[PDB]
């Protein structure tokens, strides 16, 4: 675990992450990708041997000893926002459960279904809630990667507003 379990936040690119392992924000498909998962696949392509997993689910793939996390949230272009909501807490929920399974004590986490997923509606606050109720439990260090400058902002109002 870490001394001191803490969330940060950075603005950046999480391939270029200093965290024990990666959380990419998969497609069900085990395929490139766009965004968040085609920076993840010019970083770490060993990692998507047989990565294809469902909504809701979390994949592990080794690239050398280095963990990537495929974390698939749901699609709002296709899901209900009932059955949408339930799928991205079920994802979180599962890199909860990778995160204990390796042992590491720090983990690189993006946004889940914030970008091309997010059905054209902001979901900043709806995703980092759901990944603060999985990851609370864990005493991994989370790091957080967003792109936008006003997200990060409003990423570090919300992990500030706890402490
Ligand atoms: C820049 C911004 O406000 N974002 C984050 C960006 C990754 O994608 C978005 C989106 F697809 C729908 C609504 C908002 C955003
Ligand atoms: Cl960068
Ligand atoms: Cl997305
Ligand atoms: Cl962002």
Known sequence: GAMAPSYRVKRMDIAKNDEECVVNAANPRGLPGDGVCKAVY???????KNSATPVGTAKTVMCGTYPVIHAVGPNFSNYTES????????????????????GVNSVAIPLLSTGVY???????????????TAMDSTDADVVIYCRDKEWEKKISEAIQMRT
């Open 42 to 48: 010019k970083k770490w392509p060993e990692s998507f």
């Open 83 to 102: 059955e949408g909501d339930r799928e991205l807490a079920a994802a979180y929920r599962e890199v909860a459960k990778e995160v204990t399974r390796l």
């Open 118 to 132: 997010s059905g054209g509606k902001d979901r900043l606050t709806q995703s980092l809630n759901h990944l603060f």
